[PDB]
Amino acid sequence: FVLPPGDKVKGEKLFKKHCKQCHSIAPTSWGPTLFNVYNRTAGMSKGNSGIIWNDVNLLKYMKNPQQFVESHIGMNFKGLSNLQERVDIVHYLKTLTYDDPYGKQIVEKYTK
Amino acid sequence: FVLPPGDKVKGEKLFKKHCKQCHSIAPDTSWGPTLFNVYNRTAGMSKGNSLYTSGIIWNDVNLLKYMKNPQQFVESHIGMNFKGLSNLQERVDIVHYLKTLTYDDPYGKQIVEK
Numbered sequence: 159f160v161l162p163p164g165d166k167v168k169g170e171k172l173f174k175k176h177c178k179q180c181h182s183i184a185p186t187s188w189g190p191t192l193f194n195v196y197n198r199t200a201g202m203s204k205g206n207s208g209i210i211w212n213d214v215n216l217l218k219y220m221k222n223p224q225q226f227v228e229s230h231i232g233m234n235f236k237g238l239s240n241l242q243e244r245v246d247i248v249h250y251l252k253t254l255t256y257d258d259p260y261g262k263q264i265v266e267k268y269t270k
Numbered sequence: 271f272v273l274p275p276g277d278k279v280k281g282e283k284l285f286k287k288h289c290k291q292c293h294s295i296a297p298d299t300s301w302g303p304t305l306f307n308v309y310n311r312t313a314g315m316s317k318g319n320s321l322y323t324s325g326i327i328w329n330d331v332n333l334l335k336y337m338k339n340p341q342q343f344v345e346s347h348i349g350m351n352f353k354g355l356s357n358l359q360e361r362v363d364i365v366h367y368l369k370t371l372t373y374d375d376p377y378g379k380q381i382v383e384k
C-alpha cells in the first residue's frame with residue numbers, strides 16, 4: 159500500500175483546523191511536536207522502536223486514535239466508574255511526593 | 271468538597287492494575303508522564319489551545335473527574351478533543367503536509383529557524 163494522491167496545502171489548512179490546538183510544528187504544546195513525526199518511533203511504543211508513524215499508521219491513528227491505541231498496545235484507559243476505586247487511587251497518588259515516607263523510598267530506589 | 275476516606279494500599283493495587291502499564295512513578299520513561307508528584311501539579315493539557323496562564327491543577331476533584339472519563343474531562347476543560355477524522359482524503363492531505371515537516375524538506379527547512 160502506497161499513500162494515495164493528496165494536497166499538502168489542504169493538509170496544512172486541515173492541520174491548522176484540527177491539530178494545531180494541541181500540537182506544535184517546531185523542532186510548549188500539550189501533545190508532542192509533530193515536526194519530523196513521519197517514520198518517527200511512536201511514544202506509545204513505551205506503553206506495556208515498536209510502532210513507526212508511517213503512512214498506514216498515521217492514517218489509522220487519525221481515523222480512530224483510541225481504537226488504534228487499543229489495537230497496537232492491547233489495552234487503553236477509558237475511565238474508572240467506581241468512585242471508591244478512584245478515591246483510593248488518589249489516596250495512593252498523594253503519597254507519591256518528596257515529603258511522604260513512601261515517596262521518599264521511591265526517590266531512594268530510583269536514585270540508586 | 272473533601273476527599274472521602276480511602277485506602278492507599280488498595281490504591282497502589284489499583285494503580286498497578288490500571289495505570290502502571292502507561293505511567294511510571296519515578297521522579298522526573300513510560301508512554302504517559304510520570305505520576306510521581308502529580309498531586310496539585312499543573313496539568314499538561316493546560317498548554318492546550320495556547321497572556322500567561324496558571325493552568326489546570328490536578329487536585330482531588332480534578333483527578334477523580336479525569337479518572338472517571340478522561341476524554342470528557344478534556345472536552346470540558348479544553349473545550350475540544352480529538353476523537354478522529356472520518357474523511358479519508360482529509361487524513362491523506364494531513365499526511366502529505368506532515369511529510370514536509372523534516373530537516374531535509376524545503377518547507378521543513380524554512381520552518382527550521384533558530
Ligand code: HEC
Pocket residue numbers: 173176177178179180181188189190192195198199200201202211219220318348350351352355364
Ligand atoms: C488535543 C486537543 C489534541 C488534538 C486536537 C490532537 N491531538 Fe494528537 N495528541 C495529543 C496528545 C496529548 C498526545 C500525546 C499522548 C498520546 O496520545 O500520544 C497526542 C499524540 C499524537 C501523536 C503521537 C506522536 C508520537 O510521537 O507518538 C500523533 C502522531 C498525533 N497526536 C497526531 C495528531 C493529528 C494528526 C491531529 C489532528 C488531525 C491531532 N493529533 C489532534 C492531543 C491532541
Ligand code: HEC
Pocket residue numbers: 205231233234235238247285288289290291292293301302303305308311312313314315328337
Ligand atoms: C495507556 C494505556 C494509559 C493508561 C492505562 C493510563 N494512562 Fe494516564 N495518560 C496516558 C498518556 C499517554 C497521557 C499523556 C497524554 C494525555 O492524554 O494527557 C496520560 C495522562 C495522564 C495524566 C495527566 C498528567 C499531567 O497532566 O501531568 C494523569 C493525571 C493520568 N494520565 C493519570 C492516569 C491514571 C490515574 C490512570 C489509571 C487509573 C491512567 N492514567 C491510566 C496514558 C495512559
